[PDB]
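Re: the multi-chain job from yesterday

Posting the exact lines I submitted so nobody has to dig through the queue logs.
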Amino acid sequence: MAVKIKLTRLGKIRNPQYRVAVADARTRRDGRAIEVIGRYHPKEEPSLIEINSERAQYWLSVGAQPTEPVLKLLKITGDWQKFKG
Amino acid sequence: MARYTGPVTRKSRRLRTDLVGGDQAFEKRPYPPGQHGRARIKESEYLLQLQEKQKARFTYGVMEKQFRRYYEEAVRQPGKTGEELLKILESRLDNVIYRAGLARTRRMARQLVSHGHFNVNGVHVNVPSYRVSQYDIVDVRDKSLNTVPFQIARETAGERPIPSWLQVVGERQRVLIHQLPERAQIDVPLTEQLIVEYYSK
Amino acid sequence: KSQQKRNRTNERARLRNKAVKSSLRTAVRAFREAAHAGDKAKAAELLASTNRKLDKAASKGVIHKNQAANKKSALAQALNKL
RNA sequence: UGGAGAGUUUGAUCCUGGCUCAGGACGAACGCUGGCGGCGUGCUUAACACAUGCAAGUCGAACGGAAAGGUCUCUUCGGAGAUACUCGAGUGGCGAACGGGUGAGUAACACGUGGGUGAUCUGCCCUGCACUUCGGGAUAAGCCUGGGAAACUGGGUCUAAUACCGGAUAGGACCACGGGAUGCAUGUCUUGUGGUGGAAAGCGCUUUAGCGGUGUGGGAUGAGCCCGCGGCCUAUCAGCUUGUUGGUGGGGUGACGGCCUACCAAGGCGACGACGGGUAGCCGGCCUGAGAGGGUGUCCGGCCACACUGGGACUGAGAUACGGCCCAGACUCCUACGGGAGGCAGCAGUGGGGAAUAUUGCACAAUGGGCGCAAGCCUGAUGCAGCGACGCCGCGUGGGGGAUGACGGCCUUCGGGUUGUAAACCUCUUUCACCAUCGACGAAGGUCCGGGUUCUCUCGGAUUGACGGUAGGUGGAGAAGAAGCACCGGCCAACUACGUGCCAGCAGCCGCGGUAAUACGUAGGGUGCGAGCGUUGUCCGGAAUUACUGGGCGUAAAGAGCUCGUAGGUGGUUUGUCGCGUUGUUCGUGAAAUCUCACGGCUUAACUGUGAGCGUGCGGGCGAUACGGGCAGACUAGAGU
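And the result, structure tokens for all chains:
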């Protein structure tokens, strides 16, 4: 039971978006997220990122473990690299 | 949830007024809707208000179930609900085209729109009921050229004075809305309050 | 189903655990007997083995050490009484 | 920027006060008809039983090991050599307690909300520190072997290990004494004294890139414990209570705790509803309503319980745990009859039940979860599809010309009217169906390339989109190809006649029909809505007919036969006080979604999305003290003597 960062599929069927959130691995796809930090869209803008990039450093400092796509988003923002720097 | 699709005389005479007309100014007939219509009739607020609601319904060609949606919106909005209803109805695509005079009848205007003869800013739309805002420019479909009802329609555009809240280019018929569609300030051929009260009872 | 290994290994674990626990309680019995007789020195030696047995098991995960705390602390006080 | 009423007692009126209707809503059944798309929902009845197939497997970078494919070698040329990529099977490690489903039971333990949780835990994550050593023995697997029909099992051989076991080779920490800094919140930090332990490992590999491993500090998560307040009916249940109430001591527990338990005391609850019965999963929220409130709590989301029935426990960081064991019991099944096996209230599916509720669908692309260094594996959850107009939203079912006052119908004062310019006919367009055709976003990842030692961040290419020829797009043909349903005395838009003749028959209330029915059957006419329309059923309102907002009790039903007086309620003038109540401020709280508003995106809408608002409400902290209230006290008219 460890805190991870998941991408929650929300909205309508064929044009959904992904809510960015910190959550325990033992939760469901749409559970009571600990705190939501931004959003993501797969359409319109190529890899549309809308991330606060403020608390990520905190939650990572606690030890939150993001998944693959989350790492990619963090790298596009530079938050992964800036945090690790 | 669909078009009336029938004779106009049955409702224009029932409501005792030529709602639109068409090629003929009006049927040049009396005021008995049907068989026994020549007899006098007793009035009610329900009859009267109902008739007024029907006048808007057929004037614009919208069915009840959608009309109540617009009603709901008008009630939600501040200002006189009737005036809000008319303005909302004026944002209708078919309405601004009809008021631009680009078709013999409103029915003709809606058919053309429903078949995409008049697109929008960038979309080949086919929705009579589309809400047209400020700077929501109509694009005349390129495929609609080499046909009748845009060139001949342009030539006959004078039959429908352009609403003061918008400007039609004519050369491109870029129906450009500048101000809000305050039809309440112009050419209102029927009541609104009676309708507003009617839907409350 | 094909997960009977879960059962078998549970059997081994519980078997050794409760065997150990019985041995612990046996030692406790001896200590308490030393308290009744008054052989404090023997009780001290047995308490030392208890220290090398009780916490040894706790380090093997038998308990979460709270039982060790209650038992060693309380009985050390009991020995302080006698 | 937010509430309408009518009909309905009498010869007539006015009041009082019942019935009904007009609206909306539904997880919806039925009827008639029936085009499409988009978006959503789909046992509400027997927590009744169940075939089929599938739902949790993974790790060779832990080890033994070689039952396969394939490799390499051998070589019988159809058998060998684990050499090894790989790997059946197996030991060991993770998880298997999440996830999925249902709501029987539960009457407040739960739920909600908010507080406490100083002797409440908290493995897998991050992080600082220290450790990261020395050894033994056995054994599964394998081989031989016994049993039984099978299930399934004994015995003997044989073997390693991040398995087991014993040495500390940490002394943070555990214990006790004493001490120091610092608590009232039943005490936290820190030093000394005595005792005092624990693991860990080694690994394969990129042949050292990496994987690791142990005790701790504190974080973080999650969970547990306790508690205030709130959220059904019943008094035709008022006496409930000896493990009960309280203490001592002891054990036990992750833990305070009659949790348990020896002894002692005799209490405790209760009309400011005990015990008991009935009914029920709770909430965010859904519906109604002007709102206050009512009803409801189905999908979705959170929380709680249950898993053929009942009971108990292990493993474990953490179980009531659908796919785990054991017992008991029921019900099915097998058998060599000896003896055994099973649990769809998980997806789909069957049967039953009933008015009724779906495909034995495709796949794991993204997302999601687990193991593993990773690649990779699994995933009937999520993601997509199929059925019903099952329900919302949205578009068509042609326009222009078009008095022939066509045909025809109906009525007719029978001259005429009406149907009706509607049709016929001329003309132009084609959304969508049909046909053809191109074929996406949703997509990042994986391989590979280049830059990059490992990393990083990146070039290019490859592949990977199940749903998919997807949709969308382009072109073609021609009004071709797609309108019905209910009602029509009034209430209530909505009628003329025929037939009929208290009969038949209609009806929500009044009610109609006793040979001239505007109320029955038919035609025609008209109205309303529209691939939906009507009926039934249910909830609200309308109903101010349970009335706080917002009603009554002289006769309309209603003032106890009267008095007393307990609890409870309520309580004059007033000083000063407390600031409990209330008010104002501030912090936290009040999740998200949903709702309002404003923007924005799906061709619009519905819908989704953004943001604000809303979140009416609690605690904490901050000022005043009016009024209320409490305390202290006074006067006097109240009342009394």
